[PDB]
Amino acid sequence: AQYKVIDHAYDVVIIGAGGAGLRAAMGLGEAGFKTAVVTKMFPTRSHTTAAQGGINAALGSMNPDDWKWHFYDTAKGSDWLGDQNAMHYLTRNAVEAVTELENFGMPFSRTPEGKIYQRSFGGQSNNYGKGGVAKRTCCVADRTGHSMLHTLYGNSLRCHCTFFIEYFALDLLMDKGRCVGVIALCLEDGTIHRFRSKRTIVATGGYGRAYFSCTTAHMNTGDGTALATRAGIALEDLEFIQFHPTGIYGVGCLITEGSRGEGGFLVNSEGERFMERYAPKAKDLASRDVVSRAETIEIMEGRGVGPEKDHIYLQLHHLPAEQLHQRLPGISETAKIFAGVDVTKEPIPVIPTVHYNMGGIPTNYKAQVIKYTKEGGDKIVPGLYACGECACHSVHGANRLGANSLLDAVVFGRACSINIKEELKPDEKIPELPEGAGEESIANLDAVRYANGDVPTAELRLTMQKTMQKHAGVFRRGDILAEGVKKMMDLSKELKRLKTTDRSLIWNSDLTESLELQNLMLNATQTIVAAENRKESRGAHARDDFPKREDEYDYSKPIEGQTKRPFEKHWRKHTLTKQDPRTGHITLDYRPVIDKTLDPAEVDWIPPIIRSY
Amino acid sequence: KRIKTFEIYRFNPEEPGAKPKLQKFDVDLDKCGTMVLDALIKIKNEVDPTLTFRRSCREGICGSCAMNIAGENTLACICNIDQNTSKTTKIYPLPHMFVIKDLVPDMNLFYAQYASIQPWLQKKTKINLGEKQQYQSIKEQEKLDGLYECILCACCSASCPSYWWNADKYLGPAVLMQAYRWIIDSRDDSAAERLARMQDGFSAFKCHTIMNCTKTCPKHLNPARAIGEIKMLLTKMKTKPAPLPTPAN
Amino acid sequence: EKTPIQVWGWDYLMRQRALKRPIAPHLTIYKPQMTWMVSGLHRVTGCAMAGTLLIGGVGFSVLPLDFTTFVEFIRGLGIPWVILDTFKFIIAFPIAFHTLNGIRFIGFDMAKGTDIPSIYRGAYLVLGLAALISLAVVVYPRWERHKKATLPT
Amino acid sequence: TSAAVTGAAPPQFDPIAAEKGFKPLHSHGTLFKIERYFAAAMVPLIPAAYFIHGREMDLCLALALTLHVHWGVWGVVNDYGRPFVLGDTLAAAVRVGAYIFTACLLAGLLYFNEHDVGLTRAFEMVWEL
Ligand SMILES: *Cc1cc2c(cc1C)nc1c(=O)[nH]c(=O)nc-1n2C[C@H](O)[C@H](O)[C@H](O)COP(=O)(O)OP(=O)(O)OC[C@H]1O[C@@H](n2cnc3c(N)ncnc32)[C@H](O)[C@@H]1O
Ligand code: HEM
Ligand SMILES: CC(C)Oc1cccc(NC(=O)c2ccccc2C(F)(F)F)c1
Ligand SMILES: O=C(O)/C=C/C(=O)O
Ligand code: SF4
Ligand code: F3S
Ligand code: FES
């Protein structure tokens, strides 16, 4: 049939209003640009609002602390797969970033003295890895992500940036390596929109919904990363899928690490803190990629708990109801609601769940999207930025440190602002749409609308999610993945036997079902192959058949006189998947990890070591 | 085997000469989650994909899945399905909202009203943004409890006949809840001029203390309490000021 | 005069009626509750009494049929004592309830006792309390109208 | 085709661009303060009348009872009688009929305690039947 199309012309457009989305939105509005924020739900509904634990920063409102020790842990937890510059950026900016939010009016919990309250979290440690556990996470008791996100939204009105809400971003506006704007659908009345813009930010959160079980939203299908792929951008580190240790057994609701941070621990059928075995130092507060395995083992070996011997207990009843009600209000509730459990009397049934994606769209410390060749390094795609979860600066590398993400969404959002208020020529004007432009995105829609297939939008989604869980799991063997990639590639082929029912333009949910599948095929398929091709065991990634972490050297034994292994023999590299969407065919380059700081004079880089907790 | 049945409001806006109606769905409680939302999701996947509503968090915190279930306004994602299958549960959208499609209300007026109360900190002594914290003691932030938690579900507002009758001129409990939120923050300076914006007849004084607001808040919050406190400030009793930021801060 | 938002609100409703969008069901579907029903009854009683006092002063003036005569062009109609004695109760109950429940609604208007349990006790404490005063106002005179249908010595 | 219109930015409220010319600090607070004190202090009154009858009673009950009711119904009218449903010109008319109701009442009540039994007595008589 036929469609209504509308044209908008904005300086900058932001795709998504999460934490990262809003922190940008307000930076530009503030310096006076004609922003537009496109999102597919009222901003307060973004997954950021479920965030619980906190945000990391060295204010030391509890005990002296240096932003340097935080940088340490970030690089450590990253299992040296992060870019050390980004990690540098992140960590000096973190004290401002947070306080900025206390000035914007966030009701952070408070120390008696009067300053921000802070709690301890998984992975972190004082004095460059030789002190006690650091208390570096700032938090609104248990509601930290929620409280923050309202605050940003609250302030997002103070600076006039036009919100296009309940709008679905279909694709980017591509002019041979130049991003001019976005195409989008308006749920409320079926009208298609085009957004001429000088600049474009993609900030759309992870793809946690690729799996059967996840701690994420129903809305978290990583359609950002879909846009880069269909714009011909290479995606990176899609094999680094964090599993969060304390998912709630039945549903997949998260129980914040902050509960371990505050004292409560893990227990197996035997009635034993098994973390004393797997992490003699950090105990129940190691990094999550470790802890998640500790559980996945315990279970595999029949020390699991319940009537199914297949999850474990998180125990907190040994703690004062005072501290519990006050430092952990929200979890106390969700415990009671979904598990039917009182944290003062019993333990909670918990089980590692797919949580965060350290993968995403490739960028520098300046948060600008980049293509890459061996031939001439990394060519920046101008007009285009990315931040948050859909981003990959690689401040996380192979394993994300906990409560560094709200951080990296505040900071690299804020970087998106500062680094456009820096290089925008108040001279030259808004990019033009090519003739007949956008027309291919809509074309997809059309056939997806009237799609007379024979497998339903929903049955497909399910099967893929089951097959992702079985294969791209916590522990991955070689012949599993290869058999995975097998099935999976049949599925990214099943998309032409697709059945749909609601033919309507207006609030067609069956149809944003379908687009949101399409956009998760491209995720999952790239996720799984990249996983398969990696023959090492670093962070989120673990192989049954390659237990060792392959670097240039072998940093187990002193360096003196060893021979540097060639770039192709080792695996300290970012995986870069391309896929052509027509075919759905994945081919894999490999970018080098960036190992240098931003100011050698201010801080010294950290050379790879053995990963001990 | 135990079969639950559901009555669900339906409106197809694109269809010519359009009428709302109740549609009936049978659901296998053995093959289903414990929550109402669960049941909804089942029948989009397994009986009817046209059935449309708003959802995100599933953990009861986004605020999207707000609606009226067996007569009460609450969150579908944290609403236990009535086990007894002799009785038929009935689901409707937030009362007296203008409906877009099926269970999907126009939320815009609500949103605007949220905006109009200026939901951000403002200071007479303008401050360096990245620099040191603002003092607030623990006694003073506890004051903000039961206030910062509002997930903006609009449950309370859609449950207040005042607000049905005069949505337009009357702010509503969700929004005044939040207005108060800002006026009583010991780091806000606009406290006097915030009250200024609602001194009129319909902005806050059109609460008749029906109380429906508090009885209904899925988040166990207390809008009326707030409203009460506002009316006071609008007349007799006063806001406190800060204790001074202690030396060595 | 309207605050800027009230103005916005107006246009919104204009916009929304302009699209012939439906209103979501409300009194028809909302669940009977003690919060709103009391409040409701409070108007009712409120207006019942005022309606009385209107057709009162006005009726009896615009009419050549004064009170005294009315009072017994009802007494002279073999009316059984109980039936008369709930008609009194009925009249007494409005005035009883609107007054007690009235004081309650001042607390609320001052954020006193505005939490579900304290809300719910009041609503009962006062619904029952009125029903009580009300009943003693009706039945106790009726007691002394039998205690003197037989004085002992 | 992508041969279509250039539209606008969907209706939104901007709370700061609105703060421009608009302050009129006209506070119904004080009135509200007193209409609540009124009923408050009018409490000991209503039981007094069960105890003490007579002719000064009738008349101040009436007095007070008018004021409360006036205020009250004004409140009732601004609730149920409103522009969206009624259209503006008829909604004025009800806002007037409010004051007609106070007058029809008080003048009607005045009459009663002059050329009929009184209020206190009208009750007395109904209790003895
Ligand atoms: C799942 C989770 C994550 C989490 C956490 C607890 C849970 C349950 N707790 C955290 C914590 O305590 N500390 C921390 O540092 N991180 C924590 N996380 C991770 C972190 O919260 C998230 O990754 C964070 O949300 C990152 O923010 P981001 O902005 O990138 O993600 P988002 O807010 O969910 O983004 C969603 C926005 O993008 C828009 N979008 C998505 N798709 C579209 C399309 N198709 N079209 C238009 N807009 C789109 C969304 O609609 C939304 O506005
Ligand atoms: C001292 C005794 C009384 C008290 C304390 C009292 C209290 C109140 C209060 C607080 C309201 C405000 C309703 C609201 O906006 O929430 C009200 C309303 C009203 N009152 Fe009274 N009242 C008393 C006696 C009466 C009597 C005897 C009558 C009738 C003759 C009456 C008639 C009304 C009417 C018609 C309203 C309309 C507003 C509404 O119902 O919401 N009042 N009363
Ligand atoms: C069915 C329930 C939820 O709702 C019903 C619907 C119809 C009107 C009302 N009750 C009122 O409407 C009412 C009662 C007392 C004071 C103020 C009001 C007011 F202002 F108008 F909202 C109750
Ligand atoms: O433990 C949590 O709350 C999760 C934190 C995170 O995702 O960073
Ligand atoms: S006070 Fe409660 S019912 Fe009201 S908007 Fe907030 S969360 Fe919803
Ligand atoms: S229901 Fe409305 S009347 Fe006030 S008490 Fe709640 S806002
Ligand atoms: S969908 Fe988040 S509140 Fe139910």
Whole-angstrom Cα distance, residue A10 to residue A431? 10
The DSSP-derived string for A313-343 is EEE-TTS-HHHHHHH-HHHHHHIIIII---T
- Measured CA to CA in angstroms, residue A497 lies from A454, A460, A516, C42 at distances of 5, 10, 16, 63
Phi, psi of A164 (to 5 degrees): -95, 90
Strands B99-101 and A55-56: unpaired
- Method of structure determination: X-ray
CB B63 within 8 A of CB B152: yes
Whole-angstrom Cα distance, residue A71 to residue B15? 59
Best of D77, D99, D126 to disrupt the C interface (most C CBs within 10 Å) is D126
For chains A and B, CB pairs below 8 A equal: 154
Q: For residue C28, give the 3-state DSSP assignment.
A: coil
Show the CA angle centred on residue A262, arms to residues A257 and A266, nearest 5°: 60
Q: For residue A368, give the 3-state DSSP assignment.
A: strand
Residue with tokens 């007849």: B201
Annotation-wise, does C104 bind a ligand? no
CA A15 to chain CA mean position, Å? 16
Please state, as a whole number, how many other Cβ atoms lie within 10 Å of the Cβ of residue B208: 18
The upper half-sphere exposure of residue B247, i.e. CA atoms within 13 Å in the direction of its Cβ, equals 0
- Spell out the residues 6+ positions from residue C131 whose beta carbon is closer than 8 angstroms to its own: C93, C96
Whole-angstrom Cα distance, residue A69 to residue A125? 7
For each of the domains in chain D, give its residue range(s) and CATH number, in order of start: 1-129 (1.20.1300.10)
Q: Which of D16, D32, D82 sits opposite B165 (nearest CB)?
A: D82
Whole-angstrom Cα distance, residue A176 to residue A381? 10
Put simply, the answer to whether C91 touches D111 (Cβ < 8 Å) is no
User: Residue D112 corresponds to which tokens in the numbers above?
Assistant: 């009663």
Q: For residue C58, give the 3-state DSSP assignment.
A: helix
Instruction: Give, for C92, the enclosing helix (H) or strand (E).
Output: helix C81-108
Q: Whose CA is nearest to atom 3 of ligand 2?
A: C99
Whole-angstrom Cα distance, residue D82 to residue D95? 9
CB A340 within 8 A of CB A241: no
Whole-angstrom Cα distance, residue A8 to residue D9? 8
Whole-angstrom Cα distance, residue A541 to residue A359? 12
Question: Smallest Cα–Cα separation from A193: which of A409, A395, A385, A438?
Answer: A438
Count of structural domains, chain C: 1
Whole-angstrom Cα distance, residue A171 to residue A174? 9
The pairs formed by B124-129 with CB atoms below 8 angstroms and a separation of 24 or more are B124/B189, B125/B189, B127/A103, B129/A100, B129/A103
Residue with tokens 């008609």: C87
C81 is in which domain, residue-wise? Answer: 1-153
The DSSP-derived string for chain B is --EEEEEEEE--TTSSS---EEEEEEEEGGGS-SBHHHHHHHHHHTT-TT-------SSS-S-TTEEEETTEEEEGGG-B--S-SSSPEEEEPSTTPBEEETTEE--HHHHHHHHHT--S---SS---SSS-PPP--HHHHHTTTTTTT-----TTGGG-HHHHHHTTT---HHHHHHHHHHHT-TT-STHHHHHHTT-STTTSTT-----HHHHH-TT---HHHHHHHHHHHTSSS----PPP--S--
User: Residue B93 corresponds to which tokens in the numbers above?
Assistant: 């959208």
- The sheet carrying A347-350 orders its strands as A265-267, A312-315, A347-350
Instruction: Give, for A235, the enclosing helix (H) or strand (E).
Output: strand A235-236
User: Residue B144 corresponds to which tokens in the numbers above?
Assistant: 């903000």
CA C97 to chain CA mean position, Å? 7
CB D49 within 8 A of CB D118: no
For chains B and D, CB pairs below 8 A equal: 49
Angle between helix D119-127 and helix D88-115 axes, rounded to 10 deg: 70
The reply to whether CATH 1.10.1060.10 applies to domain B107-249 is yes
Whole-angstrom Cα distance, residue B193 to residue B186? 15
What's the CATH class of domain A549-613? few secondary structures
Question: Smallest Cα–Cα separation from A6: which of A428, A507, A433?
Answer: A433
Whole-angstrom Cα distance, residue D45 to residue B31? 64
Best of C11, C61, C144 to disrupt the D interface (most D CBs within 10 Å) is C61
Residue with tokens 């800027």: C4
The reply to whether CATH 3.10.20.30 applies to domain B1-106 is yes
Whole-angstrom Cα distance, residue A104 to residue A140? 14
Give the CATH superfamily of A1-247+352-431. Answer: FAD/NAD(P)-binding domain (3.50.50.60)
CB A572 within 8 A of CB A81: yes
Q: Which CATH number fits domain A248-351: 3.40.190.10, 3.40.50.300, 3.90.700.10, 3.40.50.10300?
A: 3.90.700.10
Q: Is D54 left (phi over 0), alpha (psi -120 to 50) or beta?
A: left
CATH number of A432-548: 1.20.58.100
The domain spans of chain A are 1-247+352-431, 248-351, 432-548, 549-613
**Which amino acid does the sequence have at C59?**
G
Whole-angstrom Cα distance, residue B44 to residue D32? 51
Please state, as a whole number, how many other Cβ atoms lie within 10 Å of the Cβ of residue D9: 11
Question: Smallest Cα–Cα separation from A55: which of A153, A124, A111, A126?
Answer: A124
Whole-angstrom Cα distance, residue A187 to residue A193? 11
The three-state (H, E, C) secondary structure of B5-32, written as one string: EEEEEECCCCCCCCCCEEEEEEEEHHHC
Q: Based on the residue annotation, tell me whether A503 is a catalytic residue of this protein.
A: no
Please tell me which chains touch A, using 3 or more CB pairs under 8 Å as the contact test: B, D
CB A612 within 8 A of CB A130: no
User: Residue C136 corresponds to which tokens in the numbers above?
Assistant: 């003693």
- Resolution expressed in Å: 2.9
User: Residue B94 corresponds to which tokens in the numbers above?
Assistant: 């937030």
- Spell out the residues 6+ positions from residue A52 whose beta carbon is closer than 8 angstroms to its own: A142, A143, A144, A145, A254, A256, A258, A330, A331
Longest dimension (CA), chain C: 84
Please state, as a whole number, how many other Cβ atoms lie within 10 Å of the Cβ of residue A378: 15
Q: Best of B110, B155, B227 to mutate for ligand 5, by most ligand atoms within 8 A of CB?
A: B155
